[PDB]
């Protein structure tokens, strides 16, 4: 496909979001879910603050969401064990404060040892499990902080190109009513197309991988130009259009 | 020659008085000017003095009394069939209504005023 | 900055024992408006007084000082301390003020009067304030449009069908409180056969009440009602036999226009107990403001009193009519305010003429001093006003917009701001 | 206090929010947390659409958050058992609520219901929280201002900073000067304010003179307090009442 | 409609074997700008060509047609098909464009030129100023300001990996365990920094091949820490034969070929017997297949991305983005400052039609006399002037303040609405 | 001959009224030839301002500036403040048609400072 690896998506989610649900066990044996703010180290292992003490079962699971343009919410769940030396404690107590800008009690600092990460693409999805090695090694997407800002700018200032991308880059069988842009990463970007028939999500790839903000804008301007030349008939559309769509329910 | 020269004198005198904020001293000037204009039987000069009276009342806060004199210049113009000062009349009346706090009524008069600016 | 404010005592915030002290009859409406406009920060005023609310709609210069002054007027008129009024005061500002008066005119704010008495009263207020200088145009404009909203809700939604009125709830409350053993078989009595009185008898009949005794001044009025509803037996008695009727009634509905109570404790004490079928309790339901029943007749063991405040008990899944009527209120409330914003450019239209005159006069005087005349003077004056008029006509025309189109209205106000910046009109 | 019961807040959260975390146990015995959309009936009982199965251990916990003006995030957690509705008339009752809440359709093969046993309730993160009996929860009613709370708050914070500042002088006994003050939330009994100052950052609870039942009730009550506060500061009338003293750091 | 567009091939999107086909020498800069303006949708043009980028700055009426006309010109000047150019072209529009040239002048992007060569070239581009209108010149002139502003407020330049610097580093990344007999062909601005960054690594002796002997002797006395010996181009193939790694920087077609290196001895067994041809000169001097030789490997300027990457070079980078952001949004503020100018011309045109018509309708009712006509005309123009002065004054705005600029543009919009200046 | 000046002077404005700049340009040339010959500074600026205006319609903006610059010279040579303000506007009008918004802006800034007096 043209989408980044699920291990990279989980890392991206962990870098952008700051609110998650800490699922744990009770003495009664019942599962319990509590909201909690969290931070992420350089490896990807989550760091959180609790008001409770370390119990006898240390195994827990941290579920984190990321809403994208209020259309799709990719989410992941770190499954592992939680527990409390001052070596790696002074380091994590600094990263937390650097993320939130707030003070932090070192008596309630916990670390969830990643065993595996479940990774979903949206709600009501199956998701693919990710090994703690593939997750630890994967790097967050380099366009994460600029994604929402660029996506929103495109949706308002280049709507002419978004509709035009639906005519020359994807092989659809219906008329376009409305089409907004959902997200954007190093490999490409997703679109949501509306029609009198129904609504789907398409993934249009970049010509080549993007590394920074200037690259994404340059890639978009290149695709916008070609898409314009095709519709205006100045050059042939010498490529295979995107055919893979995806059902969704709005 | 003698009466006409007396008219123009007191006429511009009032405008001098209106130029600074002494309307009570101004109202007196146009009051004479109107009386002199009527005896001279000059419709053109009569509506000029009539306008001063209305403007002076507006400065005293006597807006409703001012409308009466601004409506006089309309009656003179309609009787003489000359459209000179009609555009100002509808505007002045709307100015008075604006100060009375009745903007809906004023707006309708301005609407007439705007249509006459063409002219 | 002038704002439309509504101040007063609603049934939801102030008790009837407090509101009745501020109940202004139609006769004193012109006086009340006169006094209110006598205040400094109050330009226009109107008084809306029903058994559910005592509300004063005013047009204020300052929405803080204006309220303070009106609240003081309420205290000096009612005798109630200002502090005690503030603990029960109802207060809304502009867009919320116009929203409220519409919801009242549409009968959305429960309860209703029944048979369209709310709308009939608003027309009467507008009719009476036609001669009143205090009644202004801004208040008249709001009230007149409120009648439109009323007529729209009456015609576009039959919400009035199942709507609970004061009289309706009076019957419902009576059958609710008296023991479940023959709520209708109990002896009924209604004092005052006016608009409120007819609706009591009507709803009694709609619950199976076959016979009702009605006390009233004019017998012709009662006979006019009997000839209207043959489904119920109506017996007429004069006021002379009032206590005689209450003594032979299990429940007494009182609606009249008497400022002083018709029942005091002393008299109800002399009355026998009610039928043992209802426990010997005589239920005085009072749907009048001021009340027709004294406030200590309930102290009698064989007598219980209910005011309009007590109609709140169970006041219905057909509430879709309420939402359909809210469509009308929202449609007109957000359209009336747009019409008001249309008039904000009027003072700017005035200042722009004044700015133009100062230039036109000055330039002509410097021209005439540096200049035989006759017809030439009238021609140069025509040039002087001709250049100005055609120059102003552009901006002037684009300051005037009315007629909805929120987008054109928005541009119209930006035109004003620009003329303020370019010519320094407001500065 | 002047704040509504924890049993009522949880009902308010369940009505406003639509997204939660379903904490559940697996065959492995590990707690698992996945995102899930839900709806609420007249009893407060949550109904959700889940794609996971089964689990054979029906013990679960649903965690739901509610962010208020991006300052405070009250959250509750329903603990109970998940099972099918009953494959009868009580299924069509749920398919209608899901269709009315979201306006979308529903796959009925995926309709699960959490049998409420007890509910946890917290005012914000890192808070201990209070358990709520399922009897108190079912009986408690949602706040009558829930659907207008967010809108009315933003309108106040944007049009009424003068009055908000003035409330910090005449309604609360603060032992410092106020730098900034935003409005957090507003419910039937009153409203919460967050005061920023070099001394600290605290949340105060200023109660209404009497309970409010509607939108008109809240605006009239606010305008009434706004009037009194103005008369006090302008010294046209005395302040004959006891100022609020209780604060709370965050 | 008008847009400032930047088009071209950067080191991050196109390989060196593709860019060198478009490396336009300084001599042909006026000709390149002349040809580009020969296009319909191109008013102004400028060419920025360094060893890491080929960029074309233009003033386009339509940007979709403007880019196309230029992309074709790039093909008609390189021989590379338009289809292939689009697969490697770099393209930013407006404030993304104005920012990019600022990020280049500040040495923020990619490997740097060194010794302010990057900033010196932009000054040189501006010095070559003939007909390159006032908008492109305006952007470049302001880029010089940003370039020197970053130079003086942030010495980020003193620790940045430069092309010549990375050439020395990459050389040590491929070479084992120096010393190890370095040789540099061509003693220029690049050649200097190659030796300078070579001396700072513990190099005892360096062989330098160059045309001018006087040029080399001037370099030896400036940096007395490393032994520098001179040999002319005649012994270029001989010096390379007595070196383990050859640095080539000149302004030449390739100097070393396939079978010219096959005839060379193997390198010392102390470094693995391999020769490193590091080519930082563009177009290249080595290539295009010398690496086919067993004892020789070629490294282009593209391979300099592999090394290096360590601390404050990202703190200084953020301190320069502060400078860039400041001047970039200040330059666009200056471009928006002039948007009201056409409106001012149209308002005079509107005012004149009324002033003329009312004066012409006046003289028809008035002939006599000499000194009166000049009095009735001054009145006519007196009313108009004092009426226009308000709006006119509030259309001309400059300096900063996001309020005065915002309000001025809204004034233009209103005058357009009120007087119907759109038509 | 003095009557021939005013004759062709107002004649040129007619062609400018009916968008014929070529026939209008010729008439103002003759008018200038007479205005200089009669030696009247006031009449000279008239034909000169007319010439520049007629050139703007032909697209000859750069040429037009020269004649709009003459009226600036006539005024300075006569110490006269007549016709100067219109010149600064007319010159700025030309630069605006050339796509050069900065010189036009500077020449418009000067134009504003004169509308006062």
Numbering used by the authors:
A (entry chain D): 56 to 139, 142 to 307
B (entry chain E): 198 to 316
C (entry chain A): 94 to 408, 413 to 468, 472 to 527
D (entry chain C): 56 to 305
E (entry chain B): 94 to 224, 228 to 273, 277 to 351, 353 to 409, 412 to 468, 471 to 527
F (entry chain F): 200 to 316
Authors' text:
Then glutamyl-tRNA reductase (GluTR) reduces the tRNAGlu-bound glutamate to glutamate-l-semialdehyde (GSA) in an NADPH-dependent manner. Three mechanisms have been characterized for plant GluTR activity regulation, which are (i) the end-product feedback inhibition by heme4, (ii) repression by a membrane protein FLUORESCENT (FLU), and (iii) formation of complex with a soluble GluTR-binding protein (GBP). GluTR consists of three domains: an N-terminal catalytic domain, an NADPH-binding domain, and a C-terminal dimerization domain8. FLU directly interacts with GluTR’s dimerization domain through its tetratricopepetide-repeat (TPR) domain7910.
In the present study, we obtained the 2:2:2 FLUTPR-GluTR-GBP complex and solved its structure. A stable FLUTPR-GluTR-GBP ternary complex was obtained with excess amounts of GBP and FLUTPR. The ternary complex crystals belong to space group C2, while the GluTR-GBP binary complex crystals belong to P212121, and the FLUTPR-GluTRDD binary complex crystals belong to P6522. The structure of the ternary complex was determined by the molecular replacement method using template coordinates of GluTR-GBP and FLUTPR-GluTRDD, and refined to a resolution of 3.2 Å. The ternary complex resembles the shape of a merged structure of the two binary complexes. The positions of GluTR’s C-terminal region are quite different when the ternary complex and GluTR-GBP are superimposed. GBP and the remainder of GluTR have no significant change, except that the linker between NADPH-binding domain and the long “spinal” helix of GluTR cannot be traced in the ternary complex. Conversely, the linker between the two C-terminal helices of GluTR that is missing in GluTR-GBP or FLUTPR-GluTRDD can be observed in the ternary complex. Compared with FLUTPR-GluTRDD, there is an extra ionic bond between the catalytic domain of GluTR and the third TPR motif of FLUTPR. The two spinal helices in the ternary complex are almost identical, which is reminiscent of Methanopyrus kandleri GluTR8.
